[PDB]
Amino acid sequence: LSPAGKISLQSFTGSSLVFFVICMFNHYYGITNLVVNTLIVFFYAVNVYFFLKFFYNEFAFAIAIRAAFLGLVLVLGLYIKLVAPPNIQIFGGYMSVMALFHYSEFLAIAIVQPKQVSTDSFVINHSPQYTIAAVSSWVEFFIETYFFPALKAIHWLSNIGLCVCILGEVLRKTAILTAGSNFNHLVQCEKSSDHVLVTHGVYAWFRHPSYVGWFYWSIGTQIILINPLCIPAYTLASWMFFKERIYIEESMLLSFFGQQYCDYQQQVGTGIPFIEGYK
Template identity: 25%
Template structure:
């Protein structure tokens, strides 16, 4: 069948339908107009009508169809050839680089800037030269390998320096929880790990055990706060209950405890010579006794106290039935257990003497405050429980 052309009216240019077989194409009659449209429009749109019901101009009668079936399906495809090129800053810099821009930059330099940049360039060159000479020197690598023999000292010293920094922030009231934990960890490292590591050249056995036991022991009061209040923070309280001995006494006590631990590491045998097995059962019993004594003493005191540190009554239960200051006694027992574990009897006697001198002074100040607060009630308790720190001894 020949193609039939039907004119269609438009405001811009006439368009025509070219119907060949079952396909209908829409195109302008004017070729110049078509070329102009294709050159100017950014997108190309093509429409295709698929006439599945045959040629509408055919004389062959077709069966009647619904009105909706007379509309052929429309398919539309849109394509765009527009693309953007990514700009490279390096290429842009070299493109903008010219002799005039270099001259303008040089004219803006002042003598001070010249001296500054020249000095910086000299430092960079000297540092690069020194680094390269050091890296290619065999003696450097030989000396560097020796430092691995002393790396625990480097770690311990770095931890101590950072611990002192955190302690300074703690005195100012600015230390967070991590910094407070760092203070405790640095102290316990220099008490339990560094001395035996220095005198033995290695670490094994009891020093590691007591490193963790010390942490657990001195964090009991924090766990009591968590149990009573639901958090770890101390509550405001009357400052009169902060029993503070003179600063010199505290410094001497701290130094004495440190010296006692170093003496124990020096006095005791080498770590691999300390027997194990059932012979250490008594030491484990002392550790458990110390932990239970500290925990129960703190817990009973907290139950009869406001804000944990302000006693509201005279506590006469738990460890307070045997000694009047079980918290101090448990601390002293912990140090004694450490000396027993390292087989250092002379160091044990030294630490006991240091603790007795310090805690005796602190206990007297505390008992005077208790008598002032509770009067006859505490006097009766003191007459009933005669021992301050050591049951049946003192």
Template identity: 30%
Template sequence: MFEDKFNVIYLVLFFLITVIRKTYTRRYGGEKIELGRENLAEIIMLSFGGIVMVSPLVFIFTSWLNFANYYLPQFIRWVGIIFFILACWLLWRSHSDLGEYWTFLLETKNKQVLVKDGVYKYMLHPMYTAHLLWALANLLIIPNWIAGPSFLLFSILLYLYRIPREETMMIKQFGEEYKEYMKKTGRVIPKLK
């Protein structure tokens, strides 16, 4: 478990990214979530995502997934560490730039403003990008066919489900201003000029 330096580094970064998310959830996203038909599917999907996100911890702390282990060269695992560090920074920066306008579910807040500065100047969905970087990091750091790719597969499905709904919601809220913002800004990767 702790004899593998990559497991230790992974745990430190996992702790860091969890602290970042929890800090902003407590500060801005702590409203009670009403369970309704419109958000039940999303809550179930996000709950499943939570399980998938901790699969590397199952890999690190137990032998349950050992049957699916494989070899990863150290160089690849170091690249994964770099991706995870970038994910931590981008998640922190995204939350910091979005501030009080962040919500856990797809909804807008009263007196919502369209945030277009900071990292949002370059990407419509930098939090999704941060999670995608984290998911890629899992794939590159965790040498296990279950714990390595599961978060990436989940993230792709989540993005396909959520991004169109989020953009529709934002267009409904902000109209032409959001449509213009979409034209100038990349979705999860900054647009090259």
């Protein structure tokens, strides 16, 4: 694929194979202490940084280091979900889901839109809104697992969350592909000359498929963690953001394609419950 896409793929799969071997080694030799493992991974994480910043300039490196980082989170998440106590095993899969999302997000953009593929398509979360909401679900899981370890041992539930996450993902990406270059991480106010309307595939089902996938995936994140507090909070925060965004995004869509979209509004719902769009 595009150049900025091959860098991420090699950095992601590469970092995921380095620390996978590391995690394999630490298992077959009974290396079980938490501070020792943290120090080994830290050791080799340092290694990957300078091997990458040596082989890459500022652009390709800020791309590579993020790719490999997610790879790290990936391997470490599965590692925790396999060898951590059953009080914690849930948080491992959660980590893995998160890493995959943030990576498959960039890779999707690099494919369908190699032109504008940056570190924001890697989309490390530095958006003051999400960061607070993300870390806040962690502090609830560990406080509820410390005081209520049993709550985090119901593995059929957390697997249900995994399910809704994988689905929301497939819909998300399958929508980013279906839309092609028309897709955009940001809402557009001016019309491109190659921007046409999409109504087939997943868009035949929803006016905002990706928003649907991202919506249920986000809810599934807290269904995995079995956080009784973050599940409702995430559902509401996600809902309102997609209400405003879907609203304005549809208004611009109305001045974009006029009646085609007014007909598309009469023919397909937004995809999220209780969001009408721009009527």
